[PDB]
Amino acid sequence: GEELFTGVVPILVELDGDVNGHKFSVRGEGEGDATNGKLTLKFICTTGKLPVPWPTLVTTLVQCFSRYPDHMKRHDFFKSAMPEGYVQERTISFKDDGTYKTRAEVKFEGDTLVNRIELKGIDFKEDGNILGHKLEYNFNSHNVXITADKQKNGIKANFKIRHNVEDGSVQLADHYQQNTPIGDGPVLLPDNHYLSTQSVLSKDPNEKRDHMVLLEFVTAAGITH
């Protein structure tokens, strides 16, 4: 488990999505450095133009790369499930707008940590903030959260993503999350805590495809030494 993440680990991300009938795919690659809670990745829309704003996909696109401080090591479900991995499912409710429902498998394939996602989005307003592409190309800092789901041998998470809108308003995206291990080996069931997140989004000047460059840092907290 934790031994798999002591160094830098390559990452592959694949997402197949359908939002209001608009089909798209995203492929990402990069690396994770859990020792420093750090993610560096570049994503490409491989089907042409992305029909939703890139920021709305960030949370979907490997929380095993969070930095858990030493006194919180016994609360790191995500690494304890590795290499066999876990299923990660979410409902993401965009306030006054549509919903994403996602199901992913996060696991090692060889030496690579792979996140393979299916996304279905429904009920979005065209000319709303998502289909109308009115969200700023940036990202905020959040608190993710985590509670134990002792019945399903897993965890749940809840959190509210804040997407800044071009007109200065905020588009809220309520996240409900469940994770369950793929194997039957023992996993860590944590006490209540949170992940403290932060991210920046940028563009590669030499990249002509629709894309997103992402840098992210995540540290667990909420349990005192």
Side-chain angles (χ1 to χ4, degrees), residues 1-149 153-207 209-225:
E2 277 160 9
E3 30 124 47
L4 294 164
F5 297 88
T6 48
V8 175
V9 176
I11 300 175
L12 170 67
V13 180
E14 300 192 329
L15 178 155
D16 286 331
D18 179 333
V19 176
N20 280 30
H22 300 99
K23 306 190 188 85
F24 60 96
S25 298
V26 173
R27 183 200 171 83
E29 63 178 35
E31 63 191 36
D33 175 21
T35 295
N36 295 302
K38 182 176 179 180
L39 289 183
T40 50
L41 290 125
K42 180 176 170 191
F43 302 89
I44 304 299
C45 179
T46 60
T47 51
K49 170 185 176 54
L50 193 67
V52 293
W54 280 106
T56 72
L57 297 180
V58 167
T59 61
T60 294
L61 275 167
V62 290
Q63 293 173 317
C64 44
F65 290 105
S66 310
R67 170 60 189 180
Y68 273 71
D70 297 344
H71 70 281
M72 295 187 67
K73 287 309 184 49
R74 78 164 46 216
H75 306 281
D76 189 351
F77 164 87
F78 307 102
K79 296 186 185 57
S80 75
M82 292 304 157
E84 302 83 356
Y86 51 79
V87 174
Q88 176 164 303
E89 283 172 310
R90 290 208 185 98
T91 302
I92 300 167
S93 311
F94 295 84
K95 185 162 185 250
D96 297 320
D97 208 333
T99 294
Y100 293 165
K101 193 173 177 177
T102 67
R103 181 193 183 273
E105 297 196 355
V106 185
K107 68 181 85 168
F108 278 88
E109 299 177 14
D111 286 327
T112 296
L113 192 284
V114 185
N115 179 20
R116 206 166 267 113
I117 314 126
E118 189 172 314
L119 181 152
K120 182 84 158 71
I122 63 169
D123 293 322
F124 286 87
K125 314 195 283 217
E126 61 264 82
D127 109 285
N129 287 332
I130 286 84
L131 295 183
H133 282 102
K134 310 176 183 179
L135 296 182
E136 299 197 277
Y137 189 69
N138 53 26
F139 219 76
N140 289 310
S141 295
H142 302 98
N143 297 31
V144 175
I146 295 171
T147 57
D149 186 11
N153 193 42
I155 59 170
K156 303 176 170 274
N158 302 92
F159 52 103
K160 202 178 307 296
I161 292 302
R162 294 172 55 91
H163 291 118
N164 288 6
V165 190
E166 284 171 350
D167 68 357
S169 64
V170 178
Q171 173 65 66
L172 299 177
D174 305 314
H175 281 60
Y176 168 74
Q177 177 184 334
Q178 309 170 333
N179 298 63
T180 58
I182 290 175
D184 36 42
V187 293
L188 292 170
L189 294 184
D191 296 345
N192 288 9
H193 68 289
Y194 62 93
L195 308 172
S196 186
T197 64
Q198 64 189 303
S199 311
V200 288
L201 313 190
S202 56
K203 303 286 196 190
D204 176 4
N206 298 325
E207 177 59 64
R209 299 164 295 181
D210 200 356
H211 71 282
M212 165 173 78
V213 179
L214 170 67
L215 172 73
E216 181 174 312
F217 296 101
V218 179
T219 307
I223 291 173
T224 117
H225 189 276

